[PDB]
Design a protein around this ligand. Structure first.
Ligand SMILES: [Mg+2]
Ligand SMILES: [Mg+2]
Ligand SMILES: [Mg+2]
Ligand SMILES: [Mg+2]
Ligand SMILES: [Mg+2]
Ligand SMILES: [Mg+2]
Ligand SMILES: [Mg+2]
Ligand SMILES: [Mg+2]
Ligand SMILES: [Mg+2]
Ligand SMILES: [Mg+2]
Ligand SMILES: [Mg+2]
Ligand SMILES: [Mg+2]
Ligand SMILES: [Mg+2]
Lengths: 321, 322
């Protein structure tokens, strides 16, 4: 009759607990669809709290009821068959709930991952386009400004590799998600990934086209500066020659021939500078440079000035003979 | 000199990332285990976040720098040999940081479970000792008060069921940790476990001793009560028989014989009550009740009074019916 009370008490506890499990099953059984990334995020985080609260509270109560029932069954209570029936029904209900919590937790993780893909694709896409937009058209005005622009571009191309990394990550996510799904869905992931890859492709193509144009414009201004330096120098040598005073005695002839021969040494020492300059110019022509017409003009001006200079040197020498 | 710019640019990114990795490694390399349960709980959560952030931020940066280094090597940069040296060492530093994060996660997890065992053992030992301090000693002085105390002891016994489940959980935790470690640490755990189990046992034995002494005490009062009810009744039946007037004519004799047979009817109606009472008394004696001497005296007073009542009823009936 103590065993009578113990039995009546256990019945109460089992009924209380199964009622509590049924309450939790309503929540765990929710089929609520996430409307967008923000909402699925909320859903997942709420249910993670719920799963943990449910497990914490329920496991202890289930263990207590199981203990009470096992004590009565093990002691050979005359209602052992009924008591075992109670215990089985409870353990089944609890196992079913935990299974359902598992299934919903999975479904919400899958959904989260899928919404996150579309989210990251929107964000990478926007970052790509925003970067594409900050990309100068101009090549620049002289040697000094072109080399600054070249260095800025080198930094820009540096400063997009981080987006590249994010693009490759998106590609891996798309791959993982496409294995999960099929039909309409795996298709839409492919399209979305493609939109981002094409935007990326276009940014790189534009960075490469700009790198190349800056090299071309740089080479142009390099060539022009080589020509200018030679032209200025040649005019100096010509003026040097023009400044020479006709000798009035043998010691003056000797001095002037020595000085003039010094000038030939100056001239000859520039041979490699002419070669470097002319080779570059001829290179640019071979590659159909946009400034080919200027470049021929400058090559012709250089060779006409060089002839002026050599003619003037030879005329002076041969009259000093 | 383009190629030089890219080299120095990479150089900076490499040294920067390595700095950043060194900073994360200081955090991952902490040897702080937590001063108590609360502390290690917090340590553990905060590094959980740290490990996630570090891995996510870190991996992208490493991968970014590898790509840039690989671009330079693949295009035959003059310093490809040196670049590959920077790259290789960065990757080693990153992989080292990742293993170190796994290591810290593991020993935080281990510290957490050890702290928690000692936190639970102290909580439970304290709860058991507190419950045991609140166990009453009084058994009651009458049937009603025993009944009340029994209700209250039932509640007490109910109150400690969840406490039992916590003790059993601690035993589970104790065996798992004892299997996990060994030497003086495992010994320390078994020591703490046995302390709780002994207090638990002490409480359970006390609750059961009380439960039983309350049943015994209540049964004694209930038996004494049953005997008293029968004694008072019997003495009144004897008084009713003794009050009867000697009949003086045939009609009176017939009326009295009827009324007398009515009295037997009333007497015989108590057969179940006597049986219940006597069986209770006998049940206490086989129990070896501590009041056995007084229970025996009462059984005898009861049966002797019933024999007296019956004898007086029968002697009256005999004299009447002749
Ligand atoms: Mg039921
Ligand atoms: Mg259901
Ligand atoms: Mg919204
Ligand atoms: Mg049945
Ligand atoms: Mg059921
Ligand atoms: Mg002139
Ligand atoms: Mg934890
Ligand atoms: Mg070396
Ligand atoms: Mg009281
Ligand atoms: Mg368990
Ligand atoms: Mg009674
Ligand atoms: Mg008659
Ligand atoms: Mg009558």
């Amino acid at each position: 009759s103590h065993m009578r009370h113990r039995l009546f008490q256990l019945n109460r506890e089992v009924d209380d607990l199964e009622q509590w499990i049924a309450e939790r099953e309503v929540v765990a059984g929710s089929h609520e669809l996430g409307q967008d990334y923000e909402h699925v995020t909320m859903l997942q985080e709420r249910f993670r709290e719920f799963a943990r609260d449910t497990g914490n509270i329920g496991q202890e109560r289930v263990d207590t009821v199981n203990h009470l029932a096992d004590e009565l069954i093990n002691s050979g209570h005359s209602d052992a068959a009924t008591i075992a029936e109670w215990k089985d029904g409870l353990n089944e209900a609890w196992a079913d709930l935990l299974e359902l919590i598992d299934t919903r937790t999975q479904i919400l993780a899958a959904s989260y991952e899928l919404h996150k893909f579309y989210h990251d694709a929107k964000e990478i896409f926007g970052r790509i386009q925003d970067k594409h937009k900050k990309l100068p058209e101009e090549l620049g005005r002289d040697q000094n400004t072109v080399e600054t622009l070249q260095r800025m571009h080198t930094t820009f191309e540096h400063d997009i590799q981080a987006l590249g990394t994010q693009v490759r990550q998106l590609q891996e996510d798309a791959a993982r998600l496409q294995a999960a799904y099929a039909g309409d869905k795996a298709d839409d992931i492919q399209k979305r990934e493609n939109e981002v890859l094409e935007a990326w492709k276009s940014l790189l193509d534009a960075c490469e086209s700009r790198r190349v144009r800056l090299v071309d414009t740089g080479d142009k201004f390099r060539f022009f500066s080589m020509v200018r330096d030679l032209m200025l120098w040649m005019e100096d040598v010509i003026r040097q020659i023009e400044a020479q005073e006709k000798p009035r005695d043998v010691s003056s002839v000797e001095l002037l021939m020595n000085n003039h021969q010094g000038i030939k040494a100056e001239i000859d020492a520039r041979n490699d500078s002419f070669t470097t300059c002319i080779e570059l110019g001829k290179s640019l022509l071979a590659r159909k440079h946009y400034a080919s017409e200027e470049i021929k003009e400058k090559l012709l001006q250089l060779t006409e000035k060089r002839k002026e200079m050599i003619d003037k040197w030879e005329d002076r020498w041969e009259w000093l003979r």
